[PDB]
UniProtKB/Swiss-Prot annotation, chain A:
Protein name: Type IV major pilin protein PilE1
Native source organism of the sequence: Neisseria gonorrhoeae
Localization per Swiss-Prot or TrEMBL: Fimbrium; Membrane
Family the entry assigns: Belongs to the N-Me-Phe pilin family.
Entry's Gene Ontology BP terms: cell adhesion
UniProtKB/Swiss-Prot annotation, chain B:
Function: Major component of the type IV pilus (T4P) that plays a role in cellular adherence, microcolony formation, resistance to neutrophil mediated killing, twitching motility as well as transformation. Mediates the attachment and the formation of bacterial microcolonies on host epithelial cells. Mechanistically, pili retractation induces host NF-kappa-B activation in infected cells, which is temporally associated with the formation of gonococcal microcolonies.
Gene this protein is translated from: pilE1
Taxonomic lineage from the root: Bacteria, Pseudomonadati, Pseudomonadota, Betaproteobacteria, Neisseriales
Residue numbers carrying N-methylphenylalanine: F1
Covered residues, full protein: 8 to 60 of 165
Protein name from the UniProt record: Type IV major pilin protein PilE1
Gene source species: Neisseria gonorrhoeae
Domain of life: Bacteria
Length: 52, 53
C-alpha cells in the first residue's frame, strides 16, 4: 500500500505493507496474512503504518 | 614355470588405484568445496542490496 499524510498545504507519501485508513490522518496495518514479505520490498518501501 | 603376466598386471592395476586414490580424493574434496562456494555466492546479491539500501 501507498498512503499519504497531511503536511498541511501538501502531503507526504509512504510505501510499505498493506494498511487501512482509520481517520484522515491515521492508517493501520491491514494485518491479515496477504502482505508482500519484507524481503521482497525495496529499501524505499519499508514504511510502517506510523511512519511520519 | 609360467603365469606371471596375469599376476603382475592384476597387481599393477591394484597399485594404480592406490596411486589414483589420493588424486581423486583431493580432486574430489576440492570439487565439493567449490560448491559450498557457489551456494555461498548468489546470496551476495541480497546482502549487497541490504547494505547499500
Amino acid at each position: 500500500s501507498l498512503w499519504a499524510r497531511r503536511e498541511n498545504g501538501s502531503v507526504k507519501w509512504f510505501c510499505g505493507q498493506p494498511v487501512t485508513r482509520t481517520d484522515d490522518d491515521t492508517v493501520a496495518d491491514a494485518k491479515d496474512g496477504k502482505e508482500i514479505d519484507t524481503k521482497h520490498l525495496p529499501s524505499t518501501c519499508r514504511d510502517n503504518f506510523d511512519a511520519k | 614355470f609360467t603365469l606371471i603376466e596375469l599376476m603382475i598386471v592384476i597387481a599393477i592395476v591394484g597399485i594404480l588405484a592406490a596411486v589414483a586414490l589420493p588424486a581423486y580424493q583431493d580432486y574430489t574434496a576440492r570439487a565439493q568445496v567449490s560448491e559450498a562456494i557457489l551456494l555461498a555466492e548468489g546470496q551476495k546479491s541480497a546482502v549487497t542490496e541490504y547494505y547499500l539500501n
